[PDB]
From a paper:
The P9-1 protein from MRCV (hereafter, P9-1) localizes in viroplasms of plant and insect hosts and, when expressed alone, self-interacts giving rise to cytoplasmic viroplasm-like structures (VLS). In addition, P9-1 binds single-stranded nucleic acids in a sequence-independent manner and has ATPase activity. Using an integrative structural approach, the C-arm was found to be dispensable for P9-1 dimer assembly but essential for the formation of pentamers and hexamers of dimers (decamers and dodecamers), which favored RNA binding. The multimeric structures of P9-1, resembling the ring-like shape of hexameric helicases, and its ATPase and RNA binding activities suggest that this protein participates in the equimolar copackaging of the viral genome.
The careful analysis of the recorded data clearly exposed doughnut-shaped (torus topology) pentamers of homodimers (10-mer D5 symmetry) and hexamers of homodimers (12-mer D6 symmetry), representing 80 to 85% and 15 to 20% of the particle populations, respectively. The global resolutions for each species were 4.7 Å (decamer) and 6.8 Å (dodecamer) based on the “gold standard” criterion (Fourier shell correlation [FSC] = 0.143), with local resolutions ranging from 2.5 to 4.5 Å (decamer) and from 5.5 to 9.5 Å (dodecamer). The doughnut-shaped P9-1 structures reveal dimensions of 12.5 nm × 12.5 nm × 8.5 nm and 14.0 nm × 14.0 nm × 8.5 nm in the decameric and dodecameric assemblies, respectively. The full-length dimers are settled in a parallel mode related by the respective 5-fold and 6-fold rotational symmetry axes holding their C-arm protrusions as staplers, as previously reported for the octameric arrangement of the RBSDV P9-1 crystal structure. In this way, the C-arm of subunit A interacts with the neighboring (−1) dimer, while the C-arm of subunit B interacts with the other-side (+1) dimer. The nascent portion of the C-arm is sandwiched between the β-sheet 3 (hairpin βF-βG + β-strand H) from one adjacent subunit and the loop βA-βB along with the helix αV from the other, while the distal portion is partially embedded on the surface of the latter nearly aligned to the helix αIV. According to the PISA server, 17 residues (~70% of the C-arm total extension) are part of the intermolecular contacts with the adjoining dimer, mostly stabilized by hydrophobic forces. Analysis of the final scattering curve with OLIGOMER revealed that P9-1 decamers and dodecamers were the predominant species in solution (fractions of 87% ± 1% and 13% ± 1%, respectively), with a small contribution by larger aggregates. Interestingly, as a result of the loop orientations, the pore is more occluded in the decamer than in the dodecamer (middle and right). The versatility of the P9-1 structure, allowing either five or six dimers to self-assemble, denotes the flexible nature of the P9-1 C-arm.
Residue numbers in the entry:
A (entry chain B), B (entry chain C), C (entry chain A), D (entry chain L): 5 to 19, 44 to 70, 74 to 107, 111 to 130, 155 to 228, 238 to 264, 269 to 337
Write the structure that this text describes.
């Protein structure tokens, strides 16, 4: 059941709406386990240095996951969630509920205080995801679909966001990609080229804004990104699921029998 | 939207049951209109003399259809049905209901009284359908499916029946094919070869039996076929429908754009 | 209650979804009556020769509308609809239901048989709409909104289509604009520039495809456009309404009174 | 998200009723925290000595609030309420309920017994609110609305009441303003001028009346104000809420792109 890396799939439901398979839920679980590409469900010539970054980031995320795996109850569904711009994972577990800020880029006054091996671990993670998106887009271009006009990149926004955060804590393409979660596929297929213009001044003074609402029972902090149009968008939760894969098995038919051979009447 | 002749298609529905597209409902309508293969929704090298028989039978069925088209009301859905062994078509029409015995082979005491042109018309029809089935089976062998074990030939039984009727009013393959409407696909894919054995005696004395039930309000006549096992099966009605084809259009994508060309960061 | 020509407006509803006001329903009614710009609900320096084309097309559409106005019953809501690519209007009328193919460009084997005054009338209509869209887009750029990322050009597709039809029966911009009814606003605000590439070959052989489905009770004809990606889209109905304008009246306040004048205590 | 001080806002709801935003709920919370104007959600030239009184009163209210903050449970919505004429705040708190008489002016036989710093604190509070109302009214005059005829000052009555209490425990404008909670906006916009006449005799003998009803389970005390018409009104509870502010963010669009530049056909 192997597949190319960074893939997506399209499935139909009707009462003919399609839905997309991301390559993330499984990707998240793989990074949870530190699993290596060989023992994965996964033609990568144009993917330079893919494996070393892959497995280094897999291990780094593996121990980070273990950091909270240690506390987990035996007894204590799966509805993993992600938050921009510190790109934090969110879990739940019942008897029959935690988080981790994978890439905190909002404020880091430990540029040299944090050890360089940890920094390289995060850099490996962010580059891995960067190339993962590059693969996902190559995949989009490689095969077009009837349903290319029905959905948007919207899931992947925060990852691109994390990219630009590193950019400030070290671009035009990834930024403007992030700017439109609602952006459609074949559009990008058309105008990957001229995505060049804000020019310098709206990002020299912070890429994002931070606002807290004093809800009188707490302090709902929130991050408010600004996009190259010079505009803004609130960051929002996005609960995940993952489709229960079909039992279907490959036909792999070998008989390929001839029919003219049989002495049919005429 | 062209396709190969004699095709079938497989469609999924779930609350993952598949259903088959026959190539008959459309085929019936085409024979209704006498339409020629060029102006059809339809790689036929192994189909000898296909076109001349095709269009001759199309015309013959066209006038036969007109025989009852003349009487039809303007105002007076579509639920066409077929009956073995005279292979009769059945129509309905409402304001917002007839039949025709296309190939009556039960009793014909007009072997020379019926003109030879009419006889050639029916022979063209029966051969056309014969090759149509041969194509359908070549199609089955050409592409196998996950769902090859889920359905049977059951729709096409009466046509094979009509074949054997001509055989008596002029075989092993088509007979035994007809014998099992419940017969599965890939089985035939396996054992097309040895389908040879009843030997002479159960068919010298009539291929079928005829029984009428005196239901006290009418005489329900019925034909009871016997199969090479030396067994029997009652012939049954089979109401038809036809799926409302999807609006889907061919992507026919031409851009096939490169991606390494864009100056992505790394 | 005057407004600039070719305008749009944005209105909120919630149980904060916005909806757009087109400038079409009213525009359609104005062309129905042949009304001139002076006696309209409507800063047009950059609109060359606007009035002469405006009123000529208004008159032409007025008589064309009268062509079916003559037959209308006294007694016999309003749910006007439009169809590409002949860009036909659709009406209904009850006691307490027609159409007209305004710009038939699918097939016209009367290039010189049709008088030149009629041809100039249609050309005036199509240019009028062309500039109307140019104004609509200037309007989009002039004022951006919070909700610029929530809707698409989708209403106006067929008009752009009619444009390209004239192009064949005499471009890159209007074509690619039409190609994406789902296209978002501020995107166009960004990349109006580089919209240049199919190159010659997919449009030399017909801009559109025509397919009829033999639904066994009729012949549902349909037109299937192809877009610069080399892809396709089915053309679809779009029922219209028009919001019942609010009773609101301009405050136009004139008092602008001072307050420090009153002998407030401190 | 800064705004001018003492503001109000107008919001629409329909099944087009408007509602007003006060500048009080937030103001109450700010005085709860002793917050200073700089770190507030808030062009004040005509506001003399605003900041010193602002922050002094903020601190005074802050400790007064702390007086009951000390007792509050950790675990133990928000429905703050105010009562004239001692202008007392009212709170509630649940697991998942107190008051404070901010400006008791009904009876104070401690004119010199109460220290002068406390007295200056209350005087700062009352002047702060006095100017706050003056700003609110300047705001009303500065921008008029369609809905100026749909609501009344009714929320702010008790504050004006507290004013007149100080007047006795040290006017025509603030008194008559208080006299009509049901008074409409643009009226005041018209006749701020001649609000002069009861003349001396109905207020020399107490501004208000006090009546207790022996409800046989308690003593429901109540204060009964008298207005310059020589009439009366019972003082009433007014439960508060505060709208959950919209997530909306400022567009702050910067592109302001030209359109004639693109080589549109005509």
């Amino acid at each position: 059941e192997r597949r190319t890396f960074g893939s997506y799939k399209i499935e139909e439901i009707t009462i003919k709406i399609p839905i997309l398979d991301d390559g993330i839920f499984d990707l998240i679980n793989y990074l949870l386990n530190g699993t290596h590409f060989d023992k994965t469900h996964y033609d990568y010539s144009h993917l330079p240095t893919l494996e070393r970054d892959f497995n280094t980031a897999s291990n780094y995320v593996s121990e980070n996951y273990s950091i909270i795996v240690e506390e987990i109850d035996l007894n204590k569904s799966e509805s993993i969630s992600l938050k921009s711009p510190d790109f934090t994972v969110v879990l739940e577990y019942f008897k029959k509920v935690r988080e981790l800020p994978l890439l905190p880029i909002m404020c880091r006054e430990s540029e040299d205080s944090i050890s360089e091996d940890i920094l390289e671990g995060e850099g490996a993670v962010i580059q891995v995801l960067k190339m993962f998106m590059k693969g996902f887009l190559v995949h989009l271009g490689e095969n077009p679909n009837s349903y290319d006009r029905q959905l948007t990149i919207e899931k992947y926004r925060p990852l691109l966001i994390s990219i630009i955060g590193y950019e400030f804590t070290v671009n035009h393409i990834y930024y403007q990609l992030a700017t439109f979660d609602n952006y459609p596929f074949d559009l990008l297929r058309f105008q990957l080229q001229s995505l060049i213009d804000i020019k310098e001044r709206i990002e020299k003074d912070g890429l994002f804004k931070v606002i807290t609402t004093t809800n009188a029972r707490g302090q709902y902090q929130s991050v408010l990104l600004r996009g190259i149009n010079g505009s803004e968008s609130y960051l929002n939760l996005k609960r995940y699921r993952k489709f229960k894969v079909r039992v279907v098995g490959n036909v792999d038919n070998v008989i390929k029998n001839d029919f003219s051979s049989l002495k049919l009447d005429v």
